[PDB]
Coordinates of C-alpha atoms and ligand atoms in Angstrom, one line a residue:
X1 CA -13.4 -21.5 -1.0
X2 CA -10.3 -19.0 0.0
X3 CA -10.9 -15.9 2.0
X4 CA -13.1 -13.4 0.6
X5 CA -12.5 -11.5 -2.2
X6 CA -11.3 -7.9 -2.4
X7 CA -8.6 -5.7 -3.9
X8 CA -5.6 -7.5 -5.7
X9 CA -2.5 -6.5 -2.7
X10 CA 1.3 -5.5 -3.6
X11 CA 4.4 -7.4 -1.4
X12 CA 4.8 -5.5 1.2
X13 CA 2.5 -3.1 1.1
X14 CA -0.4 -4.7 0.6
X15 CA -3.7 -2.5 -0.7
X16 CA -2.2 0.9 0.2
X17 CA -2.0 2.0 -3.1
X18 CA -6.0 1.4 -3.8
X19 CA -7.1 2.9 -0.3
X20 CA -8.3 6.5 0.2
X21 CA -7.0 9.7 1.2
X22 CA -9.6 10.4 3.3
X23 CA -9.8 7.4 5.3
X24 CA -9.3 3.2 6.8
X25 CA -13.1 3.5 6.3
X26 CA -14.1 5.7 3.6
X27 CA -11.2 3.4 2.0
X28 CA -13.4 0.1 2.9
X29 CA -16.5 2.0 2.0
X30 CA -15.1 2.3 -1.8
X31 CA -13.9 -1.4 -1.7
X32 CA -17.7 -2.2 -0.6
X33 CA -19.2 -1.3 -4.0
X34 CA -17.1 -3.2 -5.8
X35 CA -16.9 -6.6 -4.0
X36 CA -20.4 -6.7 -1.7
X37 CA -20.7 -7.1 1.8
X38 CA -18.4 -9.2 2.6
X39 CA -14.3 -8.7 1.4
X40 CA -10.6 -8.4 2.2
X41 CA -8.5 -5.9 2.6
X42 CA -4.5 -6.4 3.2
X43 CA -4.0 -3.9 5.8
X44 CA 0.0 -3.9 5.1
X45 CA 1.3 -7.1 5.6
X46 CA -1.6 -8.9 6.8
X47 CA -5.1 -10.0 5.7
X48 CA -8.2 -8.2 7.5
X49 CA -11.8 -9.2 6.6
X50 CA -14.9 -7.0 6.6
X51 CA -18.3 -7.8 7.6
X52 CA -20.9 -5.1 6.1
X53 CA -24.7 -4.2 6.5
X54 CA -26.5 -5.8 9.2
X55 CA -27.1 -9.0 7.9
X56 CA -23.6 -9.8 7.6
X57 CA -22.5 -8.9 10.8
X58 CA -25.1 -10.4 13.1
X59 CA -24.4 -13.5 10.7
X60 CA -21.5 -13.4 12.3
X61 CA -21.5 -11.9 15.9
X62 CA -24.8 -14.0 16.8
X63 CA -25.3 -17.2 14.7
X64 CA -21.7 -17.5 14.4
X65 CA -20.9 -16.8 17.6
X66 CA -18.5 -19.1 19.4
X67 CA -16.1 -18.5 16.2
X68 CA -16.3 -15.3 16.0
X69 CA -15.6 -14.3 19.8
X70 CA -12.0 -12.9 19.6
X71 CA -10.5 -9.9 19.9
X72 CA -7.9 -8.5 17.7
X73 CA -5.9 -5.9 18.5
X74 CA -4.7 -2.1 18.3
X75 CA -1.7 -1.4 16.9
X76 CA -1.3 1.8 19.0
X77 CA -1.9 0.5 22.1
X78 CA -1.2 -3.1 21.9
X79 CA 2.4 -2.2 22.9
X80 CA 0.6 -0.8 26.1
X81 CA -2.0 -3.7 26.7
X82 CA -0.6 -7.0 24.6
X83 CA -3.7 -8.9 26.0
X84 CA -4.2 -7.5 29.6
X85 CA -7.4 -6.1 30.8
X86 CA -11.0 -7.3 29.6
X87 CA -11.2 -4.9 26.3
X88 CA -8.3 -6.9 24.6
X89 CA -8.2 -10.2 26.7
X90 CA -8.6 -13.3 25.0
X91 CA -9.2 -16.8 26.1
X92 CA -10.0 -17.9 29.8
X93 CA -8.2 -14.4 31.0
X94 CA -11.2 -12.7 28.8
X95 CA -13.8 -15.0 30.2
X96 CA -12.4 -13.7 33.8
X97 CA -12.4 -10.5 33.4
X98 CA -15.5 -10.2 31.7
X99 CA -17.0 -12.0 34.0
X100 CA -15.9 -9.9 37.3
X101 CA -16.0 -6.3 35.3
X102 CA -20.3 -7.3 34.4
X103 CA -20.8 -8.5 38.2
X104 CA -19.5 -4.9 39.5
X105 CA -21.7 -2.7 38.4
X106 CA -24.9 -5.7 37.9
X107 CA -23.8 -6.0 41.7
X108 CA -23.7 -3.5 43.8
X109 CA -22.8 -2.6 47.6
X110 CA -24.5 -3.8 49.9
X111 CA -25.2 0.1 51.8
X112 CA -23.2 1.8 48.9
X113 CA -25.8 4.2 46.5
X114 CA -27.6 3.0 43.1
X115 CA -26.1 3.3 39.7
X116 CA -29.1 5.5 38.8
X117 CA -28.6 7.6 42.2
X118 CA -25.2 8.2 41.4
X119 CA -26.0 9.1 37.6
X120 CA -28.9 11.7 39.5
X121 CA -26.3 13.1 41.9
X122 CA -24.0 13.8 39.2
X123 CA -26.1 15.9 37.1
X124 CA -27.2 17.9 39.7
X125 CA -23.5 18.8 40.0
X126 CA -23.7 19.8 36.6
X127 CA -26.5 22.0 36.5
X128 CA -25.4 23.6 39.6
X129 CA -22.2 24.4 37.9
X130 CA -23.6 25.5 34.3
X131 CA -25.4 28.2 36.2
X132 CA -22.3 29.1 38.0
X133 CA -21.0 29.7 34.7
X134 CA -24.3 32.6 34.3
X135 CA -24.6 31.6 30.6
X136 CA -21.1 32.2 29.4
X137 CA -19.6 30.4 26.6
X138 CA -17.5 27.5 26.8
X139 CA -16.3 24.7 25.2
X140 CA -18.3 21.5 26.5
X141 CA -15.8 19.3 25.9
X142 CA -14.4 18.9 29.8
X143 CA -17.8 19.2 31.3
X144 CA -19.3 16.2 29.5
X145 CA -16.0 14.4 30.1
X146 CA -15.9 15.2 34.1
X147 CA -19.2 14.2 34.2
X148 CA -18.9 10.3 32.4
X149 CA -15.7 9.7 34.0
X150 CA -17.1 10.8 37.6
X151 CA -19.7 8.0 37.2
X152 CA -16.7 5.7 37.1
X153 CA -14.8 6.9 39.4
X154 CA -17.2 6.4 42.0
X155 CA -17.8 2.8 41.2
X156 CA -13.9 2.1 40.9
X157 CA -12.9 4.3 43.2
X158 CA -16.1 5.0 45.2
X159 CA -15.8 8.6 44.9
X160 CA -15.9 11.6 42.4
X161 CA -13.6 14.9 41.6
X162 CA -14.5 18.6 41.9
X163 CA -15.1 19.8 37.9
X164 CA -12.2 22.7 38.9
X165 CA -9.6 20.3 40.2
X166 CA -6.6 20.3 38.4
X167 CA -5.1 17.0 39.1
X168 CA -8.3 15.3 37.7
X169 CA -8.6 18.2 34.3
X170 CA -5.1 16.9 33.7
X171 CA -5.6 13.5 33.2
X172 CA -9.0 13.7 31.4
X173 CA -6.8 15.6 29.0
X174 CA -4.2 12.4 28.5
X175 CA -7.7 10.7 28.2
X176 CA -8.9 12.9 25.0
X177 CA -5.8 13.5 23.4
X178 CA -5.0 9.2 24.1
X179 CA -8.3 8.9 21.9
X180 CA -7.6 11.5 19.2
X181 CA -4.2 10.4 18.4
X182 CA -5.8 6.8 17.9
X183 CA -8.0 8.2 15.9
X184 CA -5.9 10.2 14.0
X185 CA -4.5 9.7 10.3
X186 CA -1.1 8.7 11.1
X187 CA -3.4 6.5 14.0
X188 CA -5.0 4.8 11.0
X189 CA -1.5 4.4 9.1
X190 CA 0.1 2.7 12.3
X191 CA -2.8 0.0 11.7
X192 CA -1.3 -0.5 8.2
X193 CA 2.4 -0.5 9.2
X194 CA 3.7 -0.8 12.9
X195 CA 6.4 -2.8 12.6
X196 CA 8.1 -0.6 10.4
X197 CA 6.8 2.8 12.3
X198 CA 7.2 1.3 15.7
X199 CA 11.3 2.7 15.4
X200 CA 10.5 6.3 14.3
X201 CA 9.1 9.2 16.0
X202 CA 5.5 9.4 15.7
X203 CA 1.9 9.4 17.8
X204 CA 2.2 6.3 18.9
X205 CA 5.1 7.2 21.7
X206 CA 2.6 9.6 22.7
X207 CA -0.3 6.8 23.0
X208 CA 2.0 5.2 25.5
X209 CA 3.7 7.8 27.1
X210 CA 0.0 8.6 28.0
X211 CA -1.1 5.0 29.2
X212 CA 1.5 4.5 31.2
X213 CA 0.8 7.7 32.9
X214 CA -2.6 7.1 33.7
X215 CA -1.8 3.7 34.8
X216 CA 0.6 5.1 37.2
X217 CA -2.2 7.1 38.8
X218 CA -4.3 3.5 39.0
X219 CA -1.2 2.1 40.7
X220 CA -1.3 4.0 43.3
X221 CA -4.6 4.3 44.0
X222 CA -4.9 0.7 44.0
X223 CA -1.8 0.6 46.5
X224 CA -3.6 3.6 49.2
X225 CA -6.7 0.6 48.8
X226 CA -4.8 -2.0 50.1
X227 CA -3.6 -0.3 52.8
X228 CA -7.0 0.6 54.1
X229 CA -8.8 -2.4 52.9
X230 CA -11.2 -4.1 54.9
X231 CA -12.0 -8.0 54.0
X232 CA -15.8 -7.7 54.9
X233 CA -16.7 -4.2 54.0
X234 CA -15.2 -3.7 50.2
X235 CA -15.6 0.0 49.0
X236 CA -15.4 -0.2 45.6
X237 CA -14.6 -2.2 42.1
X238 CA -10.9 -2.0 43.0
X239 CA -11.3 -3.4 46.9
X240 CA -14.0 -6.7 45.1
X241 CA -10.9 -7.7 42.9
X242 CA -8.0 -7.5 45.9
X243 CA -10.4 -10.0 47.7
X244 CA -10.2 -12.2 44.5
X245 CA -6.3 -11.6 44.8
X246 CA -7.3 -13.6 47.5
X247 CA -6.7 -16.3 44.9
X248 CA -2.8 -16.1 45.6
X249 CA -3.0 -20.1 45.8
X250 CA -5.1 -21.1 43.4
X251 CA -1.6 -22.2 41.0
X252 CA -1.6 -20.0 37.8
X253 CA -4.6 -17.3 38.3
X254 CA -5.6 -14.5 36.0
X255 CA -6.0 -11.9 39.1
X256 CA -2.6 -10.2 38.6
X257 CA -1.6 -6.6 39.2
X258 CA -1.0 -6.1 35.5
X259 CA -4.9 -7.2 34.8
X260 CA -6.1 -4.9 38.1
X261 CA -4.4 -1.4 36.6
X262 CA -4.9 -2.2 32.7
X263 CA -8.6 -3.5 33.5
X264 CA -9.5 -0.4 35.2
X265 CA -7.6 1.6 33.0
X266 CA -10.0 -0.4 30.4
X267 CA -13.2 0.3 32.3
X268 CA -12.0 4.5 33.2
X269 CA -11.1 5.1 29.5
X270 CA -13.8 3.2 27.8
X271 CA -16.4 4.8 30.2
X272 CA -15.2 8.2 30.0
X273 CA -14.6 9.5 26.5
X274 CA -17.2 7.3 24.7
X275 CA -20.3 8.6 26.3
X276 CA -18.7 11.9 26.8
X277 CA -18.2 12.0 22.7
X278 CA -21.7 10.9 22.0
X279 CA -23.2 13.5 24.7
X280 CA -21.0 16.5 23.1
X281 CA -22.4 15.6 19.2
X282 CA -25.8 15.5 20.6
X283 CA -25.9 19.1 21.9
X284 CA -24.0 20.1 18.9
X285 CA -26.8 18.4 17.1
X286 CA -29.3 20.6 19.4
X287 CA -27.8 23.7 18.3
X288 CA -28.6 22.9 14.7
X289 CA -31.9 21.6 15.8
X290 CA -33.4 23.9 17.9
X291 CA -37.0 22.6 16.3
X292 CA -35.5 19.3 18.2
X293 CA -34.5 20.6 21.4
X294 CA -38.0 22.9 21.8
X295 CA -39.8 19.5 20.9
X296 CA -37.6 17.6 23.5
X297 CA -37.9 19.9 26.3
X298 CA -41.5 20.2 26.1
X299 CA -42.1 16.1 26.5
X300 CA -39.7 16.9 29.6
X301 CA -42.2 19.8 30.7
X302 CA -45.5 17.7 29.5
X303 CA -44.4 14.3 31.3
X304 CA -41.7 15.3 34.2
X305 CA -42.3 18.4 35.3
X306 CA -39.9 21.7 35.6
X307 CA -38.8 21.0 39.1
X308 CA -38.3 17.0 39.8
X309 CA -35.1 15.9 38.6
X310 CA -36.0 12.7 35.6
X311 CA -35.4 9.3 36.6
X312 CA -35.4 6.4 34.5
X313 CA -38.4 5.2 35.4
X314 CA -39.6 8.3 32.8
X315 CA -37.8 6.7 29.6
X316 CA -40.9 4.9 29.2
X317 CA -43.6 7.7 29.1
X318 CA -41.6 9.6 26.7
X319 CA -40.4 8.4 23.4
X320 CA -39.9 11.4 21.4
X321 CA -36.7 11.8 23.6
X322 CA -35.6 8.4 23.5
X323 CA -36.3 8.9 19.6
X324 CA -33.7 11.4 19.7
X325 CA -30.7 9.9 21.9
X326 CA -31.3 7.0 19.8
X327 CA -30.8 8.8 16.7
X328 CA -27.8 10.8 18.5
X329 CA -25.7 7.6 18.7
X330 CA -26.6 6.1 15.5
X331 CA -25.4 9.3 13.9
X332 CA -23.1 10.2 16.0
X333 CA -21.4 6.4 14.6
X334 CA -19.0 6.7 17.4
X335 CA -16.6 3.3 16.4
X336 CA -17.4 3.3 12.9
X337 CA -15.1 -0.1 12.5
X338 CA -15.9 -1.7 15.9
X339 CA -13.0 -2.7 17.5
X340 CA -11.4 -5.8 15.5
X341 CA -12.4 -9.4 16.6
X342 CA -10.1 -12.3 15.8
X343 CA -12.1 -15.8 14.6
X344 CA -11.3 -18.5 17.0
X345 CA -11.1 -21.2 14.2
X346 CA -10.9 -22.2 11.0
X347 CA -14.3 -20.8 10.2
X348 CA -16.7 -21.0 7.3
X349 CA -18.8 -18.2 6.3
X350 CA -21.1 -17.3 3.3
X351 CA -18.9 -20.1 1.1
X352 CA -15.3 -18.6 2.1
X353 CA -12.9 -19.8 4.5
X354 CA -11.4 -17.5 7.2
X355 CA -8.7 -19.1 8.6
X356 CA -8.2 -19.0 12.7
X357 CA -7.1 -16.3 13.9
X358 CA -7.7 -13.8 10.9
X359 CA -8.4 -10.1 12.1
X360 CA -11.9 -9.1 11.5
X361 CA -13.3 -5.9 11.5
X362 CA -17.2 -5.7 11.9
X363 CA -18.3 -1.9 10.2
X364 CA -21.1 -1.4 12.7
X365 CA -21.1 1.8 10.3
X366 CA -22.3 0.3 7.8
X367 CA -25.8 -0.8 9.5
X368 CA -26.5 2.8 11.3
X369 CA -26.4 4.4 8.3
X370 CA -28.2 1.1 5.9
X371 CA -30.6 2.9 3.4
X372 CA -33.3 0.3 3.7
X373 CA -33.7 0.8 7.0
X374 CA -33.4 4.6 7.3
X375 CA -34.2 6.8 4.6
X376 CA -31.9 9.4 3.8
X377 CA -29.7 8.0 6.3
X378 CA -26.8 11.0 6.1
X379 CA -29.4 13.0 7.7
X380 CA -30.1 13.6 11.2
X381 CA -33.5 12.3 12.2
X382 CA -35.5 11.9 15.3
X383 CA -38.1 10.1 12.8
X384 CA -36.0 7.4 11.9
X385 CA -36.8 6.4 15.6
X386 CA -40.8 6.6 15.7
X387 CA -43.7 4.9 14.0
X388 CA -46.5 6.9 12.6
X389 CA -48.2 8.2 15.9
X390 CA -45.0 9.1 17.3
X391 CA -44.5 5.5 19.0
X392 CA -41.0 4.4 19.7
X393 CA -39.9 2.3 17.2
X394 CA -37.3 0.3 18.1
X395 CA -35.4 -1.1 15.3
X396 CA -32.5 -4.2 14.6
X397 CA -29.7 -2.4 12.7
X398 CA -29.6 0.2 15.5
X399 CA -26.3 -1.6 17.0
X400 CA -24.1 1.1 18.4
X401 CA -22.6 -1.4 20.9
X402 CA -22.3 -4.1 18.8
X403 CA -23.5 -7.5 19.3
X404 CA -22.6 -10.8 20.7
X405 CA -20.0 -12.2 23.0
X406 CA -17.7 -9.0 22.9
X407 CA -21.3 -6.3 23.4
X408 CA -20.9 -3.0 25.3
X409 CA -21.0 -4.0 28.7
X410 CA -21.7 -0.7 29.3
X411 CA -24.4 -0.5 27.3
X412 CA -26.7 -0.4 30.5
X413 CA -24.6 2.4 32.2
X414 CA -23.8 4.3 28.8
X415 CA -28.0 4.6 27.9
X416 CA -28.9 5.5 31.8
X417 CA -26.4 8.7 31.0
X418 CA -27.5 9.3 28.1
X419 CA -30.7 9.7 29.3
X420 CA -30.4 11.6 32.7
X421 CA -28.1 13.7 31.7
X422 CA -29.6 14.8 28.5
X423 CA -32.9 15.0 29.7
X424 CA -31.8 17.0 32.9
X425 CA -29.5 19.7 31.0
X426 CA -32.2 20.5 28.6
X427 CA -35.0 20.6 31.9
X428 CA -33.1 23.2 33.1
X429 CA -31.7 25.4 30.1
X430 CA -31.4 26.1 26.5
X431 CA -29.1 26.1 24.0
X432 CA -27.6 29.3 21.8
X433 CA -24.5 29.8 19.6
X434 CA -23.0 32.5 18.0
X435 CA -23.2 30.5 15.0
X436 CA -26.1 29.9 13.1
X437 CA -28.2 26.8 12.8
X438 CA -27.8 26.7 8.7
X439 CA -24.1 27.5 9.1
X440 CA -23.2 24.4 11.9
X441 CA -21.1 22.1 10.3
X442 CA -20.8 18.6 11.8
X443 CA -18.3 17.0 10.1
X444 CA -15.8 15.9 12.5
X445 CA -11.9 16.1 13.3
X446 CA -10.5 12.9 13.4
X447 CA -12.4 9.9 11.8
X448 CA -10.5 6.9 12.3
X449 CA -11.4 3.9 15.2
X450 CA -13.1 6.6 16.8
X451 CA -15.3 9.5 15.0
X452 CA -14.8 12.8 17.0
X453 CA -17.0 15.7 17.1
X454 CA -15.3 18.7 15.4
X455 CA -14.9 21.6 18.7
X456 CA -17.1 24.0 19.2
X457 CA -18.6 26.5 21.4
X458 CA -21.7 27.0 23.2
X459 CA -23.9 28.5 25.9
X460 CA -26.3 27.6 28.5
X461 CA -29.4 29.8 29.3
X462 CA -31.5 29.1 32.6
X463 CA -35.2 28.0 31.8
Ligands
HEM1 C1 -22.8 5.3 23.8 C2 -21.6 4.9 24.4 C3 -20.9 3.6 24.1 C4 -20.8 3.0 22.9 C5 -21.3 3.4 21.5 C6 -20.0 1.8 23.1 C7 -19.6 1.0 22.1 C8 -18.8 -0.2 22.2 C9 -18.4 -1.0 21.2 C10 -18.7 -0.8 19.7 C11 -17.7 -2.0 21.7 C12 -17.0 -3.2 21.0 C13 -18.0 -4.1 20.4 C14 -17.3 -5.3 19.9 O1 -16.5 -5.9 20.7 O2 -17.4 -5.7 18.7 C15 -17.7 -1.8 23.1 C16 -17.0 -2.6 24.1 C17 -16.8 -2.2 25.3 N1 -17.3 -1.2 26.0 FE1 -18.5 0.2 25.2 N2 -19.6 1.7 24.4 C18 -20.2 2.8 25.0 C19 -20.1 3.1 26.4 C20 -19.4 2.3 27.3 C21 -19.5 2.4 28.7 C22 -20.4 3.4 29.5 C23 -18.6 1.5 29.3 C24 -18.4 1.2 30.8 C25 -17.2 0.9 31.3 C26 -18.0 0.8 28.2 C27 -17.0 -0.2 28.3 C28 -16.7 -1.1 27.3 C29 -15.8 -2.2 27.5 C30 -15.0 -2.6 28.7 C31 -15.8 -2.9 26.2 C32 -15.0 -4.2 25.8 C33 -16.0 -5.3 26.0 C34 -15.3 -6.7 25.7 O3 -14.4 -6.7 24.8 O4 -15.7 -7.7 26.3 N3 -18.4 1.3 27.0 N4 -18.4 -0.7 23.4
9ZJ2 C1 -15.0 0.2 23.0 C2 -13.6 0.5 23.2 N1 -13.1 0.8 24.5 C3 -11.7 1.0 24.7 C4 -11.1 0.9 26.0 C5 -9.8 1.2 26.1 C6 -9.0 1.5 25.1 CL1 -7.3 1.9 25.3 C7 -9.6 1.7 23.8 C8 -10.9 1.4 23.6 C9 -11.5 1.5 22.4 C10 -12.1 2.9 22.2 C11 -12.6 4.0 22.1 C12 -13.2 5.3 22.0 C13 -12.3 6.5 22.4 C14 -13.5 6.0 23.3 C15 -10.4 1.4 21.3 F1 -9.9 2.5 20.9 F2 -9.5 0.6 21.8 F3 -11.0 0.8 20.2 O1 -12.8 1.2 22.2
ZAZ3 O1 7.1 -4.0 6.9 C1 6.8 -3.0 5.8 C2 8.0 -2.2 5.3 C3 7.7 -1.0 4.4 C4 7.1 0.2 5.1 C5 7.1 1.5 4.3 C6 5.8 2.3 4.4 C7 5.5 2.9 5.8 C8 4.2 3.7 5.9 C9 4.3 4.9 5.0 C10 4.6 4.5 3.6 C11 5.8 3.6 3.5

């Protein structure tokens, strides 16, 4: 009737001494087999719980909703954030935020273009820019990052930036290395002991340095807005919430400046190098697969067509592809801890007690790679995604974006790129390495809140 069990902790240092060189979660992984699916770890001075396997966690996230709503924090960034913008709100300034950030892209301008259009538009960009490149190699990386961020952009900013523009390659940099640093070792030792780290050098200064330099960019954009705005024609995300500034009387309101720049620094950031990861390990995964890719493009040539660019309406008539994003991002594991959600109360759960306002981590991890419901789940496989006649089948532990009150509200966006983008690359080219197939290795740099594909090179070869 305490909190769960786990690992006996030390004063001070709590369980570092029975964690694991490698990692926070191959560390939690170990501490998994010993105590079941449900534990806790002492992450320095504090107490964090884990949630494993499936089960557990939509225990939790669904049936045990309203107490486990809340969001933890960072360490590395919370020095930027400490509770602003909808990613690490809480309370009534979470149900705000959240609120406003779903009903801007679920509603859109009244003249201004489709989600989907601007998703099409995009990739056209692309292609006509991979073939400018006349099958050189290059390192994906900023490509699939320009393109994510520029569907953003134009529904925060209403507008997008040229792929050889310099300002924009800058800060899509600050962006990458922001997200690597988090995920980095000492990143993961920060978790365990900020408040001694916070007064030496180290990452985190970077992590900020960083955020506040982005920010700044937001800040000024968001000042050339209100300049130009006009009360009944809003351009953009950034133009809906001035109008809600429009709240200036309405006596304690949770529509300040610091919300506007750290929300859409939120929205940019989360948007950008999330889908961008998952879109970069998928082609990597292509070159390793060519058996995939050849199988891929011919549903494309079979159901779309060499010359029509997809649409979504063309997810449905071809599963084989979906098959294979699906099994992209479940392999791809890109938060393998979630981000850390707070209970909201006293809460009971499985016979233990977690006390209000315990951190809880929720290793989504943990249910994309669940034996029972994928065998040989280390393995990358389209299969794991279709029935016996090559059927989609769709299946509960696939829960990339989590689950709950806290869920991906990108998820909509995120899938719609996957798609399109995907789908159009491979209509239009194919995929070669120096490196052979047998000799890809896709373990990653950097496996820490974030798993991040390890760098590579490629080329693109018109069809
Ligand atoms: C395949 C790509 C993506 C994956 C795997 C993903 C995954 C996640 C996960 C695991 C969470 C936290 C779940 C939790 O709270 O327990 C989350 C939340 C969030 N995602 Fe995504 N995401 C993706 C793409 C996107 C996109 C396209 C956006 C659009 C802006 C986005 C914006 C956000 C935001 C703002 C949150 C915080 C939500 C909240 O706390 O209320 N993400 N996502
Ligand atoms: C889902 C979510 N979105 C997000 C948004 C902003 C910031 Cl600073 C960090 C994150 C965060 C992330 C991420 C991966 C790098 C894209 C984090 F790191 F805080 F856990 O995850
Ligand atoms: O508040 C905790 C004080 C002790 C911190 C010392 C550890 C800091 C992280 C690396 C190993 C030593």
């Amino acid at each position: 009737g305490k909190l769960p069990p786990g690992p006996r902790p030390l004063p001070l240092l709590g369980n570092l001494l029975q964690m694991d060189r490698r990692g926070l979660l191959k560390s939690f992984l170990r501490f998994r087999e010993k105590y079941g699916d449900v534990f806790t770890v002492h992450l320095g001075p504090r107490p964090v719980v884990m949630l494993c396997g499936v089960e557990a966690i939509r225990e939790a996230l669904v049936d045990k909703a309203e107490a486990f709503s809340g969001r933890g924090k960072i360490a590395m960034v919370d020095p930027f954030f400490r509770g602003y913008g909808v990613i690490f709100a809480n309370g009534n300034r979470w149900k705000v935020l959240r609120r406003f950030s779903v009903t801007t892209m679920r509603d859109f301008g009244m003249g201004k273009r489709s989600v989907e259009e601007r998703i099409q538009e995009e990739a056209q960009c692309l292609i006509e820019e991979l073939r400018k490149s006349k099958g050189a190699l290059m390192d994906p990386t900023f490509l699939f990052q320009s393109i994510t961020a520029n569907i953003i952009c134009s529904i925060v900013f209403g507008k997008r930036f040229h792929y050889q523009d310099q300002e924009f390659l800058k800060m899509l940099n600050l962006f990458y290395q922001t997200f690597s640093l988090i995920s980095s070792v000492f990143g993961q030792l920060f978790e365990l002991f900020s408040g001694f780290l916070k007064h030496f050098p180290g990452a985190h200064r970077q992590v900020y340095k960083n955020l506040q330099e982005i920010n700044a960019y937001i800040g000024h954009s968001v000042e050339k807005h209100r300049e130009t705005l006009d009360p009944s024609a809003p351009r953009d995300l950034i133009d809906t919430y001035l109008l809600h500034m429009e709240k200036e009387k309405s006596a304690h309101s949770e529509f300040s400046h610091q919300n506007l720049n750290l929300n859409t620094l939120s929205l940019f950031f989360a948007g950008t190098e999330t889908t961008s990861t998952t879109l970069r390990y998928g082609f990597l995964l292509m070159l390793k697969y060519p058996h995939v890719a050849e199988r891929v493009y011919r549903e494309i040539e079979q159901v779309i067509g060499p010359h029509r660019p997809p649409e979504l309406h063309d997810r449905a008539k071809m599963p084989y592809t979906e098959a294979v994003i699906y099994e992209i991002q479940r392999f791809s594991d890109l938060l393998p801890m979630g981000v850390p959600h707070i209970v909201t109360q006293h809460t009971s759960f499985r016979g233990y007690i977690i006390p209000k306002d315990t951190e809880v981590f929720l290793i989504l991890s943990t249910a994309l790679h669940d034996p029972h419901y994928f065998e040989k789940p280390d393995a990358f496989n389209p299969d794991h995604f279709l029935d016996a006649n090559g059927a989609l089948k769709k299946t509960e532990a696939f829960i990339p974006f989590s689950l709950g009150k806290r869920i991906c509200l990108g998820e909509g966006i995120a899938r719609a790129e996957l798609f399109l983008f995907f789908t159009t690359i491979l209509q239009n080219f194919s995929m070669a390495s120096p490196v052979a197939p047998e000799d890809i290795d896709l373990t990653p740099q950097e496996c820490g809140v974030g798993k991040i594909p390890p760098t590579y090179q490629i080329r693109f070869l018109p069809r």
